[PDB]
From a paper:
We solved the crystal structure of OXA-436 to high resolution (1.80 Å) with good overall geometry. Chloride ions are observed bridging the dimer interfaces, stabilized by the guanidine group of Arg206 from each chain of the dimers, as has previously been shown for OXA-48, in contrast to the cation-mediated dimerization observed for OXA-10 and OXA-14. In the α3–α4 loop there are two differences: Ala104 in OXA-436 corresponds to Thr104 in OXA-48, and Asp110 in OXA-436 is Asn110 in OXA-48. In the β5–β6 loop, there is only a difference between Val213 in OXA-436 and Thr213 in OXA-48. In OXA-436, a hydrophobic environment with Val213 and Val120 surrounds the R 1 phenyl ring of ampicillin.
The carbapenem-hydrolyzing class D β-lactamase OXA-436 has been characterized as a mesophilic variant of OXA-48, with an observed average thermal stability of 53.8°C and an increased response to changes in temperature when compared with OXA-48.
Residue numbers in the entry:
A (entry chain A), B (entry chain B): 25 to 265
The structure:
């Protein structure tokens, strides 16, 4: 691994602190601004919708990316959540209640078994079955997110190939003539320290760069920095124009 | 079907002529600027890379989207062709020689059978096996492109679900927070009349709009118009911002 303490400027410039981790697939070399925070584990929050989606698809809890999950009629604080969703829009708008019902149907035994097979973080689901990724005992670091994401990219996780392709479709975030981004955001607010996440990868013509970013997030006002800081580093390193 | 002549403004501004065809999947209604040209058949040229990809994958000529197809060492006029490619970059850069080798390995009997199964245009492959979509007997209209693409979107073509998801991945062209475009360009120059194509669809949160465009292309100078004129119509109908 390679440490560049100069990169810390991107976080301090915004009066916060955090970590960016990059991985070059062709050369098999990793880069970060801070090796210790790169290996520090946090609640995954909505980045857990990647493994949760995979498990639900493989077990038949979700039939495909078109199946409609009806609003239960309870008015919640996020307007985007108070409507019907399929897998694509539930990912895009990070619809917590849809995923809470997934976890209930998967069950404790099958959830635990899958995460052990995935080698996902500390593999620990202690807490409520329907909120453990929000205020329970599961933890994962930026470097661990990278390792998990590399297996998904190569279809190496122990679920069907079909499941892995459908989730990668649902992760699609941005695309143009120069690159494709597949990724997922997160915001952990229930337990200190509050942090924001962005994890995923960038597909180029002849290479792939994996990334995992997190940063302290005392208020929701700074959530855009999740993407902004990551893109600033990528542009800096000439990965994107 | 419904005719909207106001769209002609977008063509005449550039002193050229053509057709745009749109299909609203939610309501099952079609729209076009020229009912007559919408049904006129042309060579598919590089839009034929969609069915050619599906067939190559389903028969194992292509193992997956990562398999590398080596350059044959002949320097052709388009520099981007003179190098190694996989399925994703061969679609992106319209690499004719890679697909000419696909066709040779598929063979006449299996190609023909697949096109009958797909209801693809006039289903006629007469000519050279390695160039019939460029200067042989196959023909397809803008309206027939729509029908074929609808089958693909719904995984209804007579190949595996997997083959269909991989080609849809390879068609990925643009994506942002407002929409996703999966499509393929074409440029028919060997046989008159010279034309340009852009065929595919736009994915929204709650609907999908299919599109098929062609226009006269006496010179390469106007190739950028395939996308800009299509985009102009979409903007007018408030489908994209
Ligand atoms: Cl995709």
């Amino acid at each position: 691994w390679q440490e560049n303490k100069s990169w810390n400027a991107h976080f301090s410039e915004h009066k916060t602190q955090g970590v960016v981790v990059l991985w070059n697939e062709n050369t098999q070399q990793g880069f970060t601004n801070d090796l210790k925070r790169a290996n520090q584990a946090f609640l995954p929050a909505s980045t857990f919708k990647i493994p949760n989606s995979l498990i639900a698809l493989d077990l038949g809890v979700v039939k495909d990316e078109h199946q409609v999950f009806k609003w239960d009629g309870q008015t919640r604080d996020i307007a985007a959540w108070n409507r019907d969703h399929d897998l694509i829009t539930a990912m895009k708008y990070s619809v917590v209640p849809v995923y809470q019902e997934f976890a209930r149907q998967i069950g404790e035994a099958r959830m635990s078994k899958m995460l052990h097979a995935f080698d996902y973080g500390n593999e620990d689901i202690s807490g409520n079955l329907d909120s453990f990724w929000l205020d329970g005992g599961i933890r994962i670091s930026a470097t661990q997110q990278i390792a998990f994401l590399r297996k998904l990219y190569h279809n190496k996780l122990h679920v069907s190939e079909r499941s892995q392709r459908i989730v990668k479709q649902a992760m699609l975030t941005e695309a143009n003539a120069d690159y494709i981004i597949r990724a997922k955001t997160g915001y952990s607010v229930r337990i200190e320290p509050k942090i924001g996440w962005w994890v995923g990868w960038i597909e180029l013509d002849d290479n792939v760069w994996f990334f995992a970013t997190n940063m302290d997030m005392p208020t929701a006002e700074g959530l855009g920095l999740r993407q902004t800081i990551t893109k600033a580093v990528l542009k800096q390193e000439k990965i994107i124009p």
